Design a protein around this ligand. Structure first.
Ligand SMILES: Nc1ccn([C@H]2C[C@H](O)[C@@H](COP(=O)(O)OP(=O)(O)OP(=O)(O)O)O2)c(=O)n1
Ligand SMILES: [Ca+2]
Ligand SMILES: [Ca+2]
Ligand SMILES: [Ca+2]
Ligand SMILES: [Ca+2]
Length: 342
DNA sequence: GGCACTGATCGGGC
DNA sequence: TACGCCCTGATCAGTGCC
């Protein structure tokens, strides 16, 4: 198969740059403000100029403002980004036999038939795709072209930003032999270190470790995944992913263990979650609590039937009481998640 | 044993 | 040092069952 993977550069910040071109070429940080104070929150993303200053996604805004105090800080406006994304996914769709929208930011296109199996016309289709997104939306993206999804994504990530990475069928075997473990999607920093400690630094090093010992360290799914990848037997099809859960979680004005203080937030979160569910009816509810130390504590329940908004209310309080009963810490954020849709 | 399911953790931007 | 919102999420121990 011939896969084109597309990944939008510094997405949220880039859209903000399209909407306010004066921000371009200067450090710009997109912030999620929690509302507790004026600066409390986290960084959703930063343009490359701000990343040069050390600004990272996930980082506390107050910490970003310390190392890059002259950056422009702006609030996240997720609906606009979703709108850009939707328009872009619609452009890609007409260039592909099958498309897998992986997230608001990225997609895989199977273009095998479309270019008559000719890999080099795939590259050109990838160039044509980048140019079109740039002309129509003023968004730069990075593209990876490869014989499978995983290699398409890896080479894309190596080519950022505004890149076009390529791995032809002839170079796959070679490429798999120098690939570092920490560069494989799905393998987090922790596991990569545990593998490194055991002498597993390259993907090819997976092939020489006893599989049963590997499974103990990585878990079965990751062990099968790594072994398939190492043997170039990864071939997963381009496929539409289905939404499995919908939720809402908010930061309270103050930490608390007071049921009556916490309840108004829990309920607003249910109201908003039900708006997002729309016609979906969930059989499972989970109440989620982020404690003062930023640990996450959850209690859930699956019903034999669908949960109406009013049942969600009553059951969510029972679950919240369960959390307060079984955990002694104060709660900073409170939310709900719904899943197991009929 | 192993299927089907469940509730819980917590990672990491899919 | 500080600290969001999201799950088109992965993982896995516990369970009842035949
Ligand atoms: N902790 C995070 C990480 C990411 N995102 C959102 C904002 C990102 O812009 C978007 C896309 O994620 P990416 O991993 O792809 O990172 P970027 O698009 O921002 O930058 P780039 O791909 O150029 O490295 O996801 C977020 O809300 N919170
Ligand atoms: Ca991405
Ligand atoms: Ca991106
Ligand atoms: Ca914990
Ligand atoms: Ca994950």
């Amino acid at each position: 198969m011939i896969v084109i993977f597309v990944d939008f550069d510094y997405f949220f910040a880039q859209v903000e740059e399209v909407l306010n071109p004066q921000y371009k070429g200067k450090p710009l940080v997109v912030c999620v403000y929690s509302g507790r104070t004026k600066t409390s929150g986290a960084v959703a993303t930063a343009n490359y100029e701000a990343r040069k200053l050390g600004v990272k996604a996930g980082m506390p805004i107050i910490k970003a403002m310390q190392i890059a105090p002259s950056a422009i800080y702006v609030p996240m406006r997720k609906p606009i980004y979703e709108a850009f994304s939707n328009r872009i996914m619609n452009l890609l769709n007409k260039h592909a036999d099958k498309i897998e929208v992986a997230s608001i930011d990225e997609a895989y296109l199977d273009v095998t038939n479309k270019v008559e199996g000719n890999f080099e016309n795939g590259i050109e289709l990838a160039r044509k795709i980048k140019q079109e997104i740039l002309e129509k939306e003023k968004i730069t993206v990075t593209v990876g072209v490869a014989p499978n999804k995983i290699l398409a994504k890896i080479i894309a990530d190596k080519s950022k930003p505004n890149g076009l990475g390529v791995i032809r069928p002839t170079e796959v075997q070679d490429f798999l032999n120098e690939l570092d473990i920490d560069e494989i999607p799905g393998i987090g920093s922790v596991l990569a270190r545990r593998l490194n400690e055991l002498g597993i630094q390259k993907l090819r090093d997976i092939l020489s470790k006893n599989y049963n010992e590997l499974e103990k360290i990585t878990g079965k799914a990751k062990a099968l995944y790594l072994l398939k990848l190492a043997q170039d037997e990864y071939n997963e099809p381009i496929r539409t992913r289905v939404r499995k859960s919908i939720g809402r979680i908010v930061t309270m004005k103050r930490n608390s263990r007071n049921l009556e203080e916490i309840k108004p937030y829990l309920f607003r979160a249910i109201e908003e979650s039900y708006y997002k569910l729309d016609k979906r009816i969930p059989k499972a509810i989970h109440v989620v609590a982020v404690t003062e130390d930023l640990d996450i504590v959850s209690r859930g329940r699956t019903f034999p039937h669908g949960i109406s908004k009013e049942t969600a209310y009553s059951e969510s309080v029972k679950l919240l009481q369960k959390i307060l009963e079984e955990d002694e810490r104060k709660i900073r954020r409170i939310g709900v998640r719904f899943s197991k849709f009929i």
